[PDB]
Swiss-Prot record, chain A:
Belongs to the NOP14 family. Residues 21-42 are annotated as: Disordered. Interacts with snoRNA U3. Interacts with EMG1, MPP10 and NOC4. Component of the ribosomal small subunit (SSU) processome composed of at least 40 protein subunits and snoRNA U3. It is found in: Nucleus, Nucleolus. Involved in nucleolar processing of pre-18S ribosomal RNA. Has a role in the nuclear export of 40S pre-ribosomal subunit to the cytoplasm. This is Nucleolar complex protein 14. The chain holds residues 5 to 116 of 810 of the full protein.
UniProtKB/Swiss-Prot annotation, chain B:
This is U3 small nucleolar ribonucleoprotein protein IMP4. It holds the Pfam family Brix. It comes from the Eukaryota. The lineage of its organism: Eukaryota, Fungi, Dikarya, Ascomycota, Saccharomycotina. The keyword Metal-binding does not apply.
Curated annotation (Swiss-Prot), chain C:
Component of the ribosomal small subunit (SSU) processome composed of at least 40 protein subunits and snoRNA U3. Interacts with snoRNA U3. Interacts with EBP2, FAF1, MPP10, RPS16A and RRP14. It comes from Saccharomyces cerevisiae (strain ATCC 204508 / S288c) (Baker's yeast). Involved in nucleolar processing of pre-18S ribosomal RNA. Belongs to the UTP11 family. It comes from the Eukaryota. Residues 1-9 have a biased composition (Basic and acidic residues). Residues 1-22 are annotated as: Disordered. It is found in: Nucleus, Nucleolus. This is U3 small nucleolar RNA-associated protein 11. The chain holds residues 2 to 50 of 250 of the full protein.
Swiss-Prot record, chain E:
Belongs to the TRAFAC class translation factor GTPase superfamily. Bms1-like GTPase family. BMS1 subfamily. It is found in: Cytoplasm; Nucleus, Nucleolus. Interacts directly with RCL1 and the U3 snoRNA to form a stable subcomplex. Component of the 90S small subunit processome also known as 90S pre-ribosome that consists of the 35S pre-rRNA, early-associating ribosomal proteins most of which are part of the small ribosomal subunit, the U3 snoRNA and associated proteins. GTPase required for synthesis of 40S ribosomal subunits and for processing the 35S pre-rRNA at sites A0, A1, and A2. Controls access of pre-ribosomal RNA intermediates to RCL1 during ribosome biogenesis by binding of RCL1 in a GTP-dependent manner and, via its affinity to U3 snoRNA, delivering it to pre-ribosomes. GTP-binding and/or GTP hydrolysis may induce conformational rearrangements within the BMS1-RCL1 complex allowing the interaction of RCL1 with its RNA substrate. Required for RCL1 import into the nucleus. This is Ribosome biogenesis protein BMS1. Signal peptide: none annotated. The gene is BMS1.
Length: 63, 282, 49, 59, 59, 40, 46
RNA sequence: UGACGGAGCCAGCGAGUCUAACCUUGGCCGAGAGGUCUUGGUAAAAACUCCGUCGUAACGAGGAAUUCCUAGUAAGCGCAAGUCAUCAGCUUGCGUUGAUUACGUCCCUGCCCUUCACAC
C-alpha cells in the first residue's frame, strides 16, 4: 500500500471506511458516516426527551 | 525436560513467595539508608534490631521488564505460532493469516485434531516463545488468547468491531518491516503488564526510518489496534491505514500456559460486582 | 438498643414458592444459596489440590 | 460427598491414594456361617444401640 | 429464562439490563432466543436452580 | 432500568480522526514505545 | 445509546455526591474541632 | 461408491441435594387457598465389517472471478460441555478414519538485506 501511497503523493506534490462487495457478474456503503448520522440523530432526540421530562408549560406559537 | 521444567517453576514460585516476605525487609533497609544520609533519628522498631543493623553492612551494596520476559528481553527475537480453534471457517483462517502478517516472526499452523497438551508441549520443544489462538462466531473473530512459554502468562482478549483486510478491494500486499510500536494511555500496573505482554511479540530494534507503525490505543479498557504506513512530508506526516481494525478487551490473565486450567489467575474481569461499570482497570 | 423503637425492630416475614412452581421445590433464599456455594467451593478446592 | 475422577485418582502419589473398598457380591463362607443370637439377645442388642444413639445426640 | 417477555422485540429493548434471582444471584440479559418468542439468554455470577425466580427491577 | 455494563464502543468517524491525530503526532515527534536491543 | 448515557450520568452523580459529603465532614471537623481543642485548653488552664 | 432390514464390533473428553415442556376434556375433596386423579393435541457413538432384498414452479453437485491449504495436514464421522468477555440462528472441546501433491527455485510477483590465522 505504501508504494502506491508514495507514488500518489509524489504525483500530487483510508480504504477501510468503505465496505465493498464482490461483483458476481464495488462500494456498498459508509459504515463510519452512516453510524454517525444514526447516532447523532438519536442523540439530539435523547436531548429533547431530557428537556421534556419535567415541563408543564410551553410557548404555544400559533403564527 | 519435563523434570527440568517442573523444578524451574517450583523455584520460581518459591522466589515470589520469599520476595513478598522480603518486601518488608527491603523497606526497612530503605529507612536506614535515608536515616544515614539525612541524619534523622531511626524509628524504635529499627533502632532495637541489632540483627538488621549487622546485616546492613553486607546489604548496603544493593541496587523494569516483567520477570518472565527479563531473561530474553532484547536479546532473542520472539518465535510465534498463530493457530485457531478446531475446524475453523474460511474467514478465521484468513484472519489468522492477517495476525501472522502483523507479527514479523509469526508462523501459521493448521489446527486439525491437535489436542491442547500436545500443542504446547510441541511448541516448547521447538523453542516457540508465544502461542496465539483465535476463535470465531459464524466467521467473525470473537476472542484472541496469547500464551507465553515456557511458564506463562496467558492473556485472553475478546475482539470487537473487527474489519479484516480481505474486506477491502485492491488493497495490495503489506510491508513486513519490523514495525514501530505505539502504546498510549496504559497507566495502571495492569496496563504496564498488558503492554509488556504485547511489546514482546515484536522484534527489538526497528530501524529509525522504518515506515510501518502498529498502535495499541487504550480507550476505556478497549484497546484499539491499528496498522499504518506513514510518509514524512515537508510540513508534517501523512499516514494510511493498512488494517485490520479491531478492539480487544482483556478479560483474563493467568500465571501459566493456556493448557493449564488450574493456573493461578493474575487478574479477571468481574462483571456482576455492584460497582463494575464505575471503574476502568487498565 | 438506644433510640430505636420496637416497631422499627419488627420481623419481616419470608415469602414462599409460587403454587404454579410448587413442583420444582422450595424457593431458595440467600442463606440457602450460601450453603450451595460454600459446599461447592470446599469440594473444588480439594479437587484442585 | 466428593467424588474424585478416576483419571486423577489413578495418577496420584503413593502417599495420597484414596482407599475405596468395593461392595461384596459373592456370599462369603464366613458370612454364611456366622450365628446371630435371636430372641432375648436381639432385644438386648436393639436396646444398646438405642442408648448409644441418645448419648451421641446429647453430646 | 421464560415468561419475562412476550416477544423477542421486547427482549431487545432490555438487553444488558441487570437481573437477579430471589437467592440474590446477579445476572444480565444477554440476548433474545429466536425460538420461542419471549425467551432469552442470561449469564449469572453463579449457577441457578430451576426453583429460582428471576426478577428485573424497573420503575 | 439499570444496565450491568457499558456497551462496546462504536467506531465513528470522529473517533477515527481522534486516533489518527494521535498517531500523526507521535510519528512527527518520532517518539515510539518499542523494545530496544540490550547491549552485549 | 440510552445505556451509555445512564451509566455516565450515574457515575457523575455519584462522584459529585461523594465529594460533597466529604467536604461537609472535613469542614466541620476542621473548624469545630479547632473550637473544641481551643476550649479544652482553656479548661486545662483554669 | 444407492435405499431398507438384521447381525458383529471399536473411543476419549464430561459428575454442584444438581437436568429442566406447553395447551386442553372432566371426576372427587376442600369455607377458601388449593390438592389428587382422568383426558386429547402440540413440541422434543458414528464410521466400519458381514449377510439378505430391490435395482441404476424449483432442481439433477454448481459459470467468470476470487480465497485458503504441506502430515496425523486436507477431508469424512460422531460424542460431550456451555466454565464472569463471546457463543445456543451457535461456540469450544474430545476421540475415530485418514490421503493426493510439493518439500525445489529465485524464472515471474512482492517484502527484505548488503555494497585473529589459512584460503579467497
Ligand atoms: Mg477440517
Ligand atoms: Mg464436527
Ligand atoms: Mg468452530
Amino acid at each position: 500500500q505504501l508504494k502506491n501511497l508514495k507514488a500518489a503523493l509524489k504525483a500530487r506534490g483510508n480504504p477501510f471506511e468503505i465496505k465493498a462487495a464482490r461483483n458476481k457478474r464495488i462500494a456498498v456503503g459508509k459504515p463510519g458516516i452512516s453510524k454517525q448520522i444514526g447516532e447523532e440523530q438519536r442523540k439530539r432526540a435523547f436531548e429533547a426527551r431530557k428537556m421534556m421530562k419535567n415541563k408543564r408549560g410551553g410557548v404555544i406559537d400559533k403564527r | 525436560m519435563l523434570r527440568r521444567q517442573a523444578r524451574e517453576r517450583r523455584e520460581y514460585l518459591y522466589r515470589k513467595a520469599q520476595e513478598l516476605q522480603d518486601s518488608q525487609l527491603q523497606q526497612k533497609r530503605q529507612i536506614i539508608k535515608q536515616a544515614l544520609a539525612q541524619g534523622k533519628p531511626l524509628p524504635k522498631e529499627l533502632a532495637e534490631d541489632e540483627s538488621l543493623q549487622k546485616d546492613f553492612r553486607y546489604d548496603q551494596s544493593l541496587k523494569q521488564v516483567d520477570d518472565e520476559y527479563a531473561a530474553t528481553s532484547g536479546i532473542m527475537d520472539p518465535r510465534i505460532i498463530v493457530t485457531t480453534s478446531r475446524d475453523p471457517s474460511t474467514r478465521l483462517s484468513q484472519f489468522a493469516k492477517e495476525i501472522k502478517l502483523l507479527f514479523p516472526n509469526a508462523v501459521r499452523l493448521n489446527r486439525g485434531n491437535y489436542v491442547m497438551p500436545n500443542l504446547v508441549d510441541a511448541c516448547k520443544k521447538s523453542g516457540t516463545t508465544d502461542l496465539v489462538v483465535l476463535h470465531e462466531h459464524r466467521g467473525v473473530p470473537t476472542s484472541l488468547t496469547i500464551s507465553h512459554f515456557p511458564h506463562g502468562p496467558t492473556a485472553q482478549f475478546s475482539l470487537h468491531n473487527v474489519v479484516m483486510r480481505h474486506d477491502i478491494i485492491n488493497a495490495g500486499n503489506q510491508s513486513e518491516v519490523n514495525p514501530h510500536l505505539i502504546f498510549d494511555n496504559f497507566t495502571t500496573a495492569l496496563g504496564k503488564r498488558v503492554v509488556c505482554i504485547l511489546k514482546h511479540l515484536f522484534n527489538a530494534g526497528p530501524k529509525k526510518d522504518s515506515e510501518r507503525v502498529i498502535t495499541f490505543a487504550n480507550r476505556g479498557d478497549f484497546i484499539s489496534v491499528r496498522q499504518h504506513v506513514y510518509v514524512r512530508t515537508r510540513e508534517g506526516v501523512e499516514i494510511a491505514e493498512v488494517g485490520p481494525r479491531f478492539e480487544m478487551r482483556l478479560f483474563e490473565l493467568r500465571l501459566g500456559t493456556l493448557e493449564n486450567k488450574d493456573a493461578d489467575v493474575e487478574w479477571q474481569l468481574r462483571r456482576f460486582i455492584r460497582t463494575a461499570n464505575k471503574k476502568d482497570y487498565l | 438498643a438506644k433510640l430505636v423503637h420496637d416497631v422499627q425492630k419488627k420481623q419481616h416475614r419470608e415469602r414462599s414458592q409460587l403454587t404454579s412452581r410448587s413442583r420444582y421445590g422450595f424457593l431458595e433464599k440467600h442463606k440457602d444459596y450460601v450453603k450451595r456455594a460454600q459446599d461447592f467451593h470446599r469440594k473444588q478446592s480439594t479437587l484442585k489440590v | 460427598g466428593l467424588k474424585v475422577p478416576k483419571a486423577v485418582q489413578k495418577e496420584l502419589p503413593f502417599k495420597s491414594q484414596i482407599h475405596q473398598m468395593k461392595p461384596q457380591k459373592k456370599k462369603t463362607y464366613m458370612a454364611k456361617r456366622a450365628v446371630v443370637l435371636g430372641g432375648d439377645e436381639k432385644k438386648a442388642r436393639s436396646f444398646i444401640q438405642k442408648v448409644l444413639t441418645i448419648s451421641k445426640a446429647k453430646d | 429464562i421464560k415468561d419475562m417477555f412476550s416477544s423477542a422485540m421486547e427482549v431487545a429493548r432490555f438487553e444488558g439490563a441487570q437481573i437477579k434471582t430471589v437467592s440474590g444471584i446477579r445476572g444480565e440479559i444477554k440476548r433474545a432466543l429466536s425460538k420461542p418468542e419471549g425467551h432469552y439468554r442470561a449469564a449469572f455470577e453463579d449457577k441457578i436452580l430451576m426453583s429460582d425466580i428471576v426478577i428485573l427491577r424497573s420503575w | 432500568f439499570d444496565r450491568t455494563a457499558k456497551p462496546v464502543p462504536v467506531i465513528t468517524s470522529e473517533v477515527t480522526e481522534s486516533l489518527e491525530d494521535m498517531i500523526r503526532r507521535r510519528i512527527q515527534d518520532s517518539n515510539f514505545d518499542d523494545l530496544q536491543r540490550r547491549t552485549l | 445509546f440510552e445505556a451509555r448515557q445512564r451509566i455516565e450520568e450515574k457515575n457523575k452523580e455519584s462522584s459529585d455526591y461523594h465529594a460533597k459529603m466529604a467536604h461537609i465532614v472535613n469542614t466541620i471537623n476542621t473548624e469545630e474541632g479547632a473550637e473544641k481543642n481551643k476550649y479544652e485548653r482553656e479548661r486545662k488552664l483554669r
